Amino acid sequence: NLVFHNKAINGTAMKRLISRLIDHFGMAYTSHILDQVKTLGFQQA
Amino acid sequence: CIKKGQILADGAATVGGELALGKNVLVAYMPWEGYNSEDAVLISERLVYEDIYTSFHIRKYEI
Amino acid sequence: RIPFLEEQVRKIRDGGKLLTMDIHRLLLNEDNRFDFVNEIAAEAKQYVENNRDEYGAKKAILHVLSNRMNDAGVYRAEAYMESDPFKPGPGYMKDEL
């Protein structure tokens, strides 16, 4: 269960999302989520 | 003929009488797959197999 | 079941993130992590003292973690050690970028 965002994502929004993911799923899932996000970000850049 | 003051020979890091400490290479400013994160450069193999940035270094040892 | 999640799970298993998941799962059942570290160290020391020649390419700590995971109902390879079936031949090593 994750929200769907239709607005611009910035550094503060990313930090908030990472904190909420650490709170909900824990650091273990957040590590893989962050790796996938980094891969997608590099690809799109 | 050469006057008193003209250049007879060209030393290291100097060509045509002007200081030359580098090379001219084609450059593009874009991110490439993370290889440019922070400051980092992605370079091609042409600089390697054409000796563009080859240098000679001499170290001495004495006893 | 997502249709296009084969390679992701394959890479998660191959890379070694299973070890991190198992460490988190085993730390979710312990009050003080320092005592858990000391217990794992003592168990690995006992394993090494029992069979010296057994280890050297297989890690005793990974073996302890795999035994603890297998005793909990989760199947894990012994000491999290896997071999590449697609290896070309002897003396050929993969280059991990």
PDB file of C-alpha atoms in Angstrom:
ATOM      1  CA  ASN A   1       0.000   0.000   0.000  1.00  0.00           C
ATOM      2  CA  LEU A   2       1.762   3.108  -1.315  1.00  0.00           C
ATOM      3  CA  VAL A   3       0.480   6.523  -2.346  1.00  0.00           C
ATOM      4  CA  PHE A   4       0.483   7.681  -5.963  1.00  0.00           C
ATOM      5  CA  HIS A   5       2.159  11.057  -6.496  1.00  0.00           C
ATOM      6  CA  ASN A   6       1.105  13.411  -9.302  1.00  0.00           C
ATOM      7  CA  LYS A   7       3.293  16.341  -8.190  1.00  0.00           C
ATOM      8  CA  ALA A   8       6.927  17.321  -8.600  1.00  0.00           C
ATOM      9  CA  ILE A   9       9.351  15.417  -6.371  1.00  0.00           C
ATOM     10  CA  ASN A  10      12.214  17.389  -4.817  1.00  0.00           C
ATOM     11  CA  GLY A  11      14.995  16.787  -2.320  1.00  0.00           C
ATOM     12  CA  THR A  12      12.863  17.490   0.744  1.00  0.00           C
ATOM     13  CA  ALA A  13      10.045  15.353  -0.660  1.00  0.00           C
ATOM     14  CA  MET A  14      12.549  12.558  -1.310  1.00  0.00           C
ATOM     15  CA  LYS A  15      13.891  12.809   2.244  1.00  0.00           C
ATOM     16  CA  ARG A  16      10.341  12.684   3.628  1.00  0.00           C
ATOM     17  CA  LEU A  17       9.502   9.657   1.480  1.00  0.00           C
ATOM     18  CA  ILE A  18      12.686   7.847   2.524  1.00  0.00           C
ATOM     19  CA  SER A  19      11.984   8.555   6.197  1.00  0.00           C
ATOM     20  CA  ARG A  20       8.418   7.261   5.848  1.00  0.00           C
ATOM     21  CA  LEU A  21       9.651   4.145   4.039  1.00  0.00           C
ATOM     22  CA  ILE A  22      12.209   3.526   6.797  1.00  0.00           C
ATOM     23  CA  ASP A  23       9.416   3.885   9.356  1.00  0.00           C
ATOM     24  CA  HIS A  24       6.947   1.618   7.548  1.00  0.00           C
ATOM     25  CA  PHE A  25       8.948  -1.122   5.807  1.00  0.00           C
ATOM     26  CA  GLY A  26      12.190  -0.818   7.786  1.00  0.00           C
ATOM     27  CA  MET A  27      15.736  -0.203   6.627  1.00  0.00           C
ATOM     28  CA  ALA A  28      16.006  -3.598   4.912  1.00  0.00           C
ATOM     29  CA  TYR A  29      13.321  -2.898   2.304  1.00  0.00           C
ATOM     30  CA  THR A  30      14.360   0.759   2.117  1.00  0.00           C
ATOM     31  CA  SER A  31      17.856  -0.236   0.975  1.00  0.00           C
ATOM     32  CA  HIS A  32      16.540  -2.081  -2.087  1.00  0.00           C
ATOM     33  CA  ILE A  33      13.929   0.620  -2.744  1.00  0.00           C
ATOM     34  CA  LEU A  34      16.671   3.259  -2.696  1.00  0.00           C
ATOM     35  CA  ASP A  35      18.896   1.212  -5.007  1.00  0.00           C
ATOM     36  CA  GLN A  36      16.059   0.828  -7.520  1.00  0.00           C
ATOM     37  CA  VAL A  37      15.248   4.542  -7.247  1.00  0.00           C
ATOM     38  CA  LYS A  38      18.906   5.406  -7.872  1.00  0.00           C
ATOM     39  CA  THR A  39      18.989   3.136 -10.924  1.00  0.00           C
ATOM     40  CA  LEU A  40      15.815   4.660 -12.382  1.00  0.00           C
ATOM     41  CA  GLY A  41      17.052   8.185 -11.644  1.00  0.00           C
ATOM     42  CA  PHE A  42      20.391   7.629 -13.354  1.00  0.00           C
ATOM     43  CA  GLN A  43      18.625   6.026 -16.325  1.00  0.00           C
ATOM     44  CA  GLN A  44      16.202   8.926 -16.778  1.00  0.00           C
ATOM     45  CA  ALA A  45      18.914  11.552 -16.259  1.00  0.00           C
TER      46      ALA A  45
ATOM     47  CA  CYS B   1      68.398  32.674 -40.993  1.00  0.00           C
ATOM     48  CA  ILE B   2      67.658  33.263 -37.305  1.00  0.00           C
ATOM     49  CA  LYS B   3      67.977  36.561 -35.444  1.00  0.00           C
ATOM     50  CA  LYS B   4      69.337  37.025 -31.916  1.00  0.00           C
ATOM     51  CA  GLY B   5      66.296  36.035 -29.877  1.00  0.00           C
ATOM     52  CA  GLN B   6      64.285  33.698 -32.083  1.00  0.00           C
ATOM     53  CA  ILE B   7      63.426  30.109 -31.156  1.00  0.00           C
ATOM     54  CA  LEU B   8      65.797  27.420 -32.412  1.00  0.00           C
ATOM     55  CA  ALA B   9      64.196  24.399 -30.732  1.00  0.00           C
ATOM     56  CA  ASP B  10      61.014  23.541 -28.836  1.00  0.00           C
ATOM     57  CA  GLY B  11      61.270  22.108 -25.337  1.00  0.00           C
ATOM     58  CA  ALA B  12      58.841  19.879 -23.499  1.00  0.00           C
ATOM     59  CA  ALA B  13      55.258  21.104 -23.039  1.00  0.00           C
ATOM     60  CA  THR B  14      55.882  23.721 -25.734  1.00  0.00           C
ATOM     61  CA  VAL B  15      55.033  23.629 -29.445  1.00  0.00           C
ATOM     62  CA  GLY B  16      55.504  26.471 -31.918  1.00  0.00           C
ATOM     63  CA  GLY B  17      56.888  28.637 -29.130  1.00  0.00           C
ATOM     64  CA  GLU B  18      53.768  28.673 -26.930  1.00  0.00           C
ATOM     65  CA  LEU B  19      53.131  26.924 -23.629  1.00  0.00           C
ATOM     66  CA  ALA B  20      51.161  23.699 -24.199  1.00  0.00           C
ATOM     67  CA  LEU B  21      50.266  21.817 -21.013  1.00  0.00           C
ATOM     68  CA  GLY B  22      47.378  19.772 -22.402  1.00  0.00           C
ATOM     69  CA  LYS B  23      45.370  18.552 -25.372  1.00  0.00           C
ATOM     70  CA  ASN B  24      42.189  19.554 -27.192  1.00  0.00           C
ATOM     71  CA  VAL B  25      39.508  16.851 -27.032  1.00  0.00           C
ATOM     72  CA  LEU B  26      35.816  16.727 -27.866  1.00  0.00           C
ATOM     73  CA  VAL B  27      33.645  17.194 -24.775  1.00  0.00           C
ATOM     74  CA  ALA B  28      29.930  16.876 -24.049  1.00  0.00           C
ATOM     75  CA  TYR B  29      28.199  18.131 -20.895  1.00  0.00           C
ATOM     76  CA  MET B  30      25.567  15.554 -19.948  1.00  0.00           C
ATOM     77  CA  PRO B  31      25.021  12.957 -17.291  1.00  0.00           C
ATOM     78  CA  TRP B  32      25.929   9.423 -18.364  1.00  0.00           C
ATOM     79  CA  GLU B  33      24.717   6.554 -16.247  1.00  0.00           C
ATOM     80  CA  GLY B  34      26.191   7.821 -13.062  1.00  0.00           C
ATOM     81  CA  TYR B  35      29.725   7.702 -14.221  1.00  0.00           C
ATOM     82  CA  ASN B  36      29.808  11.456 -13.952  1.00  0.00           C
ATOM     83  CA  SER B  37      28.431  11.711 -10.397  1.00  0.00           C
ATOM     84  CA  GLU B  38      30.086  14.332  -8.301  1.00  0.00           C
ATOM     85  CA  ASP B  39      33.042  15.093 -10.395  1.00  0.00           C
ATOM     86  CA  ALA B  40      34.117  12.233 -12.496  1.00  0.00           C
ATOM     87  CA  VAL B  41      34.791  11.897 -16.153  1.00  0.00           C
ATOM     88  CA  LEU B  42      33.950   9.194 -18.607  1.00  0.00           C
ATOM     89  CA  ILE B  43      36.498   9.060 -21.360  1.00  0.00           C
ATOM     90  CA  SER B  44      36.834   7.035 -24.489  1.00  0.00           C
ATOM     91  CA  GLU B  45      39.482   4.502 -25.486  1.00  0.00           C
ATOM     92  CA  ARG B  46      40.677   6.772 -28.314  1.00  0.00           C
ATOM     93  CA  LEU B  47      42.690   8.749 -25.761  1.00  0.00           C
ATOM     94  CA  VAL B  48      44.279   5.444 -24.743  1.00  0.00           C
ATOM     95  CA  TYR B  49      45.166   3.745 -28.025  1.00  0.00           C
ATOM     96  CA  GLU B  50      46.231   6.993 -29.755  1.00  0.00           C
ATOM     97  CA  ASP B  51      48.628   8.142 -26.985  1.00  0.00           C
ATOM     98  CA  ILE B  52      46.826  11.468 -26.499  1.00  0.00           C
ATOM     99  CA  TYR B  53      47.697  11.761 -22.792  1.00  0.00           C
ATOM    100  CA  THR B  54      50.814   9.586 -22.658  1.00  0.00           C
ATOM    101  CA  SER B  55      53.612  10.936 -20.476  1.00  0.00           C
ATOM    102  CA  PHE B  56      57.088   9.843 -19.520  1.00  0.00           C
ATOM    103  CA  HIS B  57      58.226   9.838 -15.937  1.00  0.00           C
ATOM    104  CA  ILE B  58      61.806   9.335 -14.790  1.00  0.00           C
ATOM    105  CA  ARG B  59      62.729   8.343 -11.203  1.00  0.00           C
ATOM    106  CA  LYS B  60      66.283   8.044  -9.879  1.00  0.00           C
ATOM    107  CA  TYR B  61      67.707   5.631  -7.299  1.00  0.00           C
ATOM    108  CA  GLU B  62      71.179   6.033  -5.796  1.00  0.00           C
ATOM    109  CA  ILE B  63      73.201   4.281  -3.086  1.00  0.00           C
TER     110      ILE B  63
ATOM    111  CA  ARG C   1       2.171 -11.890  -8.714  1.00  0.00           C
ATOM    112  CA  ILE C   2       3.925  -9.285 -10.860  1.00  0.00           C
ATOM    113  CA  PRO C   3       4.821 -10.756 -14.283  1.00  0.00           C
ATOM    114  CA  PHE C   4       8.252  -9.178 -14.847  1.00  0.00           C
ATOM    115  CA  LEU C   5       9.942  -9.717 -11.477  1.00  0.00           C
ATOM    116  CA  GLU C   6      12.133 -12.728 -12.319  1.00  0.00           C
ATOM    117  CA  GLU C   7      15.451 -10.959 -12.927  1.00  0.00           C
ATOM    118  CA  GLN C   8      15.041  -8.725  -9.869  1.00  0.00           C
ATOM    119  CA  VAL C   9      14.564 -11.657  -7.478  1.00  0.00           C
ATOM    120  CA  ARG C  10      17.386 -13.504  -9.245  1.00  0.00           C
ATOM    121  CA  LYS C  11      19.754 -10.574  -8.701  1.00  0.00           C
ATOM    122  CA  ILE C  12      18.632 -10.182  -5.079  1.00  0.00           C
ATOM    123  CA  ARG C  13      19.444 -13.844  -4.433  1.00  0.00           C
ATOM    124  CA  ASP C  14      22.743 -13.784  -6.334  1.00  0.00           C
ATOM    125  CA  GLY C  15      24.138 -10.533  -4.935  1.00  0.00           C
ATOM    126  CA  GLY C  16      23.822 -11.363  -1.249  1.00  0.00           C
ATOM    127  CA  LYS C  17      20.953  -9.210  -0.010  1.00  0.00           C
ATOM    128  CA  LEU C  18      19.527 -12.416   1.471  1.00  0.00           C
ATOM    129  CA  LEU C  19      22.224 -12.070   4.135  1.00  0.00           C
ATOM    130  CA  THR C  20      21.033  -8.558   5.007  1.00  0.00           C
ATOM    131  CA  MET C  21      17.402  -9.695   5.167  1.00  0.00           C
ATOM    132  CA  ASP C  22      18.333 -12.600   7.444  1.00  0.00           C
ATOM    133  CA  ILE C  23      20.405 -10.307   9.673  1.00  0.00           C
ATOM    134  CA  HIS C  24      17.454  -7.932  10.022  1.00  0.00           C
ATOM    135  CA  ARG C  25      15.104 -10.842  10.746  1.00  0.00           C
ATOM    136  CA  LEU C  26      17.453 -12.212  13.418  1.00  0.00           C
ATOM    137  CA  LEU C  27      17.884  -8.750  14.970  1.00  0.00           C
ATOM    138  CA  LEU C  28      14.098  -8.305  15.111  1.00  0.00           C
ATOM    139  CA  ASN C  29      14.123 -11.105  17.730  1.00  0.00           C
ATOM    140  CA  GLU C  30      16.824  -9.714  20.031  1.00  0.00           C
ATOM    141  CA  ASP C  31      16.761  -6.953  22.633  1.00  0.00           C
ATOM    142  CA  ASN C  32      20.474  -6.055  22.612  1.00  0.00           C
ATOM    143  CA  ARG C  33      22.371  -6.400  19.338  1.00  0.00           C
ATOM    144  CA  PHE C  34      25.742  -6.522  21.119  1.00  0.00           C
ATOM    145  CA  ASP C  35      24.876  -9.739  22.958  1.00  0.00           C
ATOM    146  CA  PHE C  36      23.660 -11.189  19.653  1.00  0.00           C
ATOM    147  CA  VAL C  37      26.995 -10.285  18.044  1.00  0.00           C
ATOM    148  CA  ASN C  38      28.890 -11.907  20.920  1.00  0.00           C
ATOM    149  CA  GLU C  39      26.739 -15.050  20.705  1.00  0.00           C
ATOM    150  CA  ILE C  40      27.293 -15.339  16.947  1.00  0.00           C
ATOM    151  CA  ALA C  41      31.028 -14.840  17.483  1.00  0.00           C
ATOM    152  CA  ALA C  42      31.148 -17.572  20.135  1.00  0.00           C
ATOM    153  CA  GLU C  43      29.170 -19.986  17.947  1.00  0.00           C
ATOM    154  CA  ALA C  44      31.443 -19.305  14.967  1.00  0.00           C
ATOM    155  CA  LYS C  45      34.489 -19.842  17.191  1.00  0.00           C
ATOM    156  CA  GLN C  46      33.069 -23.200  18.282  1.00  0.00           C
ATOM    157  CA  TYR C  47      32.388 -24.128  14.646  1.00  0.00           C
ATOM    158  CA  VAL C  48      35.958 -23.223  13.665  1.00  0.00           C
ATOM    159  CA  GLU C  49      37.459 -25.136  16.597  1.00  0.00           C
ATOM    160  CA  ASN C  50      35.376 -28.201  15.722  1.00  0.00           C
ATOM    161  CA  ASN C  51      36.419 -28.373  12.036  1.00  0.00           C
ATOM    162  CA  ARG C  52      39.374 -26.248  10.920  1.00  0.00           C
ATOM    163  CA  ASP C  53      39.904 -27.757   7.462  1.00  0.00           C
ATOM    164  CA  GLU C  54      36.193 -27.410   6.657  1.00  0.00           C
ATOM    165  CA  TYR C  55      36.499 -23.624   6.426  1.00  0.00           C
ATOM    166  CA  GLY C  56      38.854 -21.389   4.461  1.00  0.00           C
ATOM    167  CA  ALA C  57      36.601 -20.772   1.487  1.00  0.00           C
ATOM    168  CA  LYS C  58      33.337 -21.197   3.435  1.00  0.00           C
ATOM    169  CA  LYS C  59      32.699 -18.696   6.226  1.00  0.00           C
ATOM    170  CA  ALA C  60      31.820 -20.044   9.665  1.00  0.00           C
ATOM    171  CA  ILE C  61      29.764 -16.937  10.471  1.00  0.00           C
ATOM    172  CA  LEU C  62      27.702 -17.360   7.307  1.00  0.00           C
ATOM    173  CA  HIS C  63      27.347 -21.039   8.227  1.00  0.00           C
ATOM    174  CA  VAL C  64      25.981 -20.093  11.658  1.00  0.00           C
ATOM    175  CA  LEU C  65      23.549 -17.633  10.077  1.00  0.00           C
ATOM    176  CA  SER C  66      22.398 -20.234   7.527  1.00  0.00           C
ATOM    177  CA  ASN C  67      21.886 -22.853  10.243  1.00  0.00           C
ATOM    178  CA  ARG C  68      19.849 -20.365  12.287  1.00  0.00           C
ATOM    179  CA  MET C  69      17.767 -19.472   9.228  1.00  0.00           C
ATOM    180  CA  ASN C  70      17.189 -23.123   8.287  1.00  0.00           C
ATOM    181  CA  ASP C  71      16.177 -23.965  11.860  1.00  0.00           C
ATOM    182  CA  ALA C  72      13.531 -21.207  11.617  1.00  0.00           C
ATOM    183  CA  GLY C  73      11.721 -22.701   8.610  1.00  0.00           C
ATOM    184  CA  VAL C  74      13.419 -20.599   5.904  1.00  0.00           C
ATOM    185  CA  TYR C  75      15.566 -22.482   3.403  1.00  0.00           C
ATOM    186  CA  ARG C  76      18.997 -20.908   2.901  1.00  0.00           C
ATOM    187  CA  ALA C  77      22.090 -22.239   1.153  1.00  0.00           C
ATOM    188  CA  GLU C  78      24.828 -23.498   3.455  1.00  0.00           C
ATOM    189  CA  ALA C  79      26.893 -20.447   4.472  1.00  0.00           C
ATOM    190  CA  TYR C  80      25.179 -18.476   1.658  1.00  0.00           C
ATOM    191  CA  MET C  81      27.709 -19.952  -0.790  1.00  0.00           C
ATOM    192  CA  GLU C  82      26.644 -20.440  -4.411  1.00  0.00           C
ATOM    193  CA  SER C  83      28.617 -21.265  -7.549  1.00  0.00           C
ATOM    194  CA  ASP C  84      28.127 -19.880 -11.043  1.00  0.00           C
ATOM    195  CA  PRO C  85      26.866 -22.677 -13.333  1.00  0.00           C
ATOM    196  CA  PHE C  86      27.621 -20.549 -16.408  1.00  0.00           C
ATOM    197  CA  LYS C  87      31.352 -20.323 -15.685  1.00  0.00           C
ATOM    198  CA  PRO C  88      33.340 -20.776 -18.927  1.00  0.00           C
ATOM    199  CA  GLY C  89      36.166 -22.876 -17.494  1.00  0.00           C
ATOM    200  CA  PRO C  90      38.920 -23.160 -14.897  1.00  0.00           C
ATOM    201  CA  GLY C  91      40.903 -19.983 -14.390  1.00  0.00           C
ATOM    202  CA  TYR C  92      38.086 -17.832 -15.813  1.00  0.00           C
ATOM    203  CA  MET C  93      36.600 -15.368 -13.321  1.00  0.00           C
ATOM    204  CA  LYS C  94      33.648 -13.044 -13.797  1.00  0.00           C
ATOM    205  CA  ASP C  95      34.164  -9.274 -13.802  1.00  0.00           C
ATOM    206  CA  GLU C  96      31.604  -7.586 -11.542  1.00  0.00           C
ATOM    207  CA  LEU C  97      31.294  -3.932 -12.556  1.00  0.00           C
TER     208      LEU C  97
END
